Design an enzyme around this catalytic site. Sequence first.
Site, mmCIF file in Angstrom:
data_model
loop_
_atom_site.group_PDB
_atom_site.id
_atom_site.type_symbol
_atom_site.label_atom_id
_atom_site.label_comp_id
_atom_site.label_asym_id
_atom_site.label_seq_id
_atom_site.Cartn_x
_atom_site.Cartn_y
_atom_site.Cartn_z
ATOM 1 C CG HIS A 1 -9.434 4.105 -1.499
ATOM 2 N ND1 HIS A 1 -10.512 3.311 -1.199
ATOM 3 C CD2 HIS A 1 -9.882 5.009 -2.418
ATOM 4 C CE1 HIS A 1 -11.546 3.690 -1.915
ATOM 5 N NE2 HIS A 1 -11.206 4.726 -2.649
ATOM 6 C CG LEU B 1 -1.781 -1.082 1.510
ATOM 7 C CD1 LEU B 1 -2.411 -0.903 2.857
ATOM 8 C CD2 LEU B 1 -2.843 -1.111 0.475
#
Lengths: 153, 153, 153, 119, 119, 119
Positions: B87, B80
């Site tokens: 998000h 990520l």
Amino acid sequence: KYDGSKLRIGILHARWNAEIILALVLGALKRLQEFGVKRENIIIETVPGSFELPYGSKLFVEKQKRLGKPLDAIIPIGVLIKGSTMHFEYICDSTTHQLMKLNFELGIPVIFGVLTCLTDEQAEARAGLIEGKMHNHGEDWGAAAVEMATKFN
Amino acid sequence: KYDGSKLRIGILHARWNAEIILALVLGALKRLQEFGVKRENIIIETVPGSFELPYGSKLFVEKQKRLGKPLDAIIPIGVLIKGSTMHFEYICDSTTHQLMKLNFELGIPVIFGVLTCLTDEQAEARAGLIEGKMHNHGEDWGAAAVEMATKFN
Amino acid sequence: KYDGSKLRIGILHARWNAEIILALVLGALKRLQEFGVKRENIIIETVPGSFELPYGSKLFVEKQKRLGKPLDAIIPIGVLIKGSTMHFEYICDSTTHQLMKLNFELGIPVIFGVLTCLTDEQAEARAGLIEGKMHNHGEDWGAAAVEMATKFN
Amino acid sequence: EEAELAYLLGELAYKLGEYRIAIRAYRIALKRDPNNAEAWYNLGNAYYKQGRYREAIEYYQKALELDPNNAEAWYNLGNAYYERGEYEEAIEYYRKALRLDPNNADAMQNLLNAKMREE
Amino acid sequence: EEAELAYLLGELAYKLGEYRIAIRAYRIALKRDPNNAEAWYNLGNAYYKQGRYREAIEYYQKALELDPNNAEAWYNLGNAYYERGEYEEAIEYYRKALRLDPNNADAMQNLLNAKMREE
Amino acid sequence: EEAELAYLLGELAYKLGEYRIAIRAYRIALKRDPNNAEAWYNLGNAYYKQGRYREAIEYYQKALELDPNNAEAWYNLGNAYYERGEYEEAIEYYRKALRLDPNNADAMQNLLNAKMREE
């Protein structure tokens, strides 16, 4: 790669921010059909918005199950755009937790079809509503539902 | 110190950010093999990304179990990187909670093979993709799986 | 005030940031012994770090229980220092939630022996590693384990 | 040259558990080449293995003078000191080993228990 | 020097049961240092072990010339002679071993049975 | 001289399964005496054993230059080539081994299967 013709996939979606959502909902449907999902096996229903979807999706599944059409996968869809209040942060979080819990509670993959954007341009780009930016993510959600629903069987 | 030759260790990983992930996945495999884990006992499979892994890992385990190859430990892997949307923050959090819950729900150690970086250079360094920075953390994940899977028996 | 001579108290701790941790681990042990806890009833074991401890502590307890030495209380110990990534925030949070859940899931008090510091000087001071700042908090953790394990009986 | 053969011979004897040979072969090899720190550490290990902890120390200390970054040796040296009851010396040798190699988990736990006993 | 390494090498080979090496290494070591009675006895033991009893005798006898108080060797020499059927020679070698070492209980019983067989 | 001790040391290491020593001891012995074909073959066997098939080939080829009638080596050389996927080279080395030694039944079956795979 995957064959979705035997799957029932539902979409439950927000009414609010419809321009973005309708692009997302169709994006997913077009791809599901490209993987062989029959249009009649794609269940599309709405709720007002993002507070309803986190549990609305269970209620949705229970109804489809009672009707003899249980889903193999679900993609709740909706758009959160940060405003002047902190509803965005708290919804984004609790929504995510409900959707992750529901991956086990419903027995089926639950796809996070919800956007957590700070601006409209970002949500619009994620839906492929902007020709020059991102892509319609709905398509990935569609494809993911097919894979998740078949991959692990 | 530990002997992993009797363990089945799975890796489920994201397809997205493959350059970083493939370095991480191999890092873990090389070490697992150094601890004696047989290559045939290392199960490597993929999912699109980080939303799939938090539950995908259970579905993965259930399949391996049905096939007669239940895992002793699992390392979901993915990256990520913070973008312009939130998000990252919501995935990082819910992912972590799912992976911690799964340490008990699956009956096996679940290694947080997920990166929560703000930049690419940070994720790349964590994978040892950058010669001058950090180390390939995948190696620690591999070693940890072996220890966690044997230490507490 | 309290007598810990009848209690089994375990410490599971991170290997990483050992200078701070070893001061914390001993701080707790010295006090536990001051409350009468026998040194043989203090179980000290390690794991790589902070991701392992949140569940590692259960696995640790289960092993001690199988061996005939169930713990009355546990103090997982470790140090989180904020870096350039957000692993600190997500670990701090999920760790805390696991440790709070484990206060009921394990049937015993679980002491938050984990630091959530932004700098090294803060973690070092909390361990009493700095003569001029704070105190060795490990001592409080030790005392707390004795009280929590006896107070409510 | 002769030292290499002597080191290979002692090495084989160490692996096989025969310290009379491991010791003589390394002493010979070292007479021929005194700067081999590894052999000096191993020589210390042979004496250590025989319970000859003071001798082990002498050789470990020589080996450290030649190469003081050998964390394992720092640990082994502390252990020879612990066996002699020399807790204060021994704890410093284990702590140095851990500082040189932070991943020496065994040193962490052993120095921690040793510290409890040191007083 | 080289003999020590050669003796250490042969010694390791004796302990490990490899006589081709134990024999060559001691012969080399002995060429370098012929007065090592222990090595000569051991050389005899290698030949003895291989069933080469006459060779064992040659080396045992040399070793005894260098150091004739080795009671164990006197015994081993008698044994090599018994294996060859040389009971009269062999009984004297066992009796000498017992006289040198009265606690060699095994020699007592073996020389006693050998005497019965000697005639 | 030194080579013999070095060959005896390496030999013992080969027998004991320790190739770091077996390799160094033979390289030393060979530096002292380069014509020892057996040691060159064995050196190749150590590398072979370690999976170092190209190195094994280098030493096997040297050893064959010194003594090309060693059928076992011809076979072992072919095997190192097969491990590298070099079927055409490897089949000739096995066939030569069989021609030198017609009783190498294992070479017969292995070259036969290798030929099937060679294509």
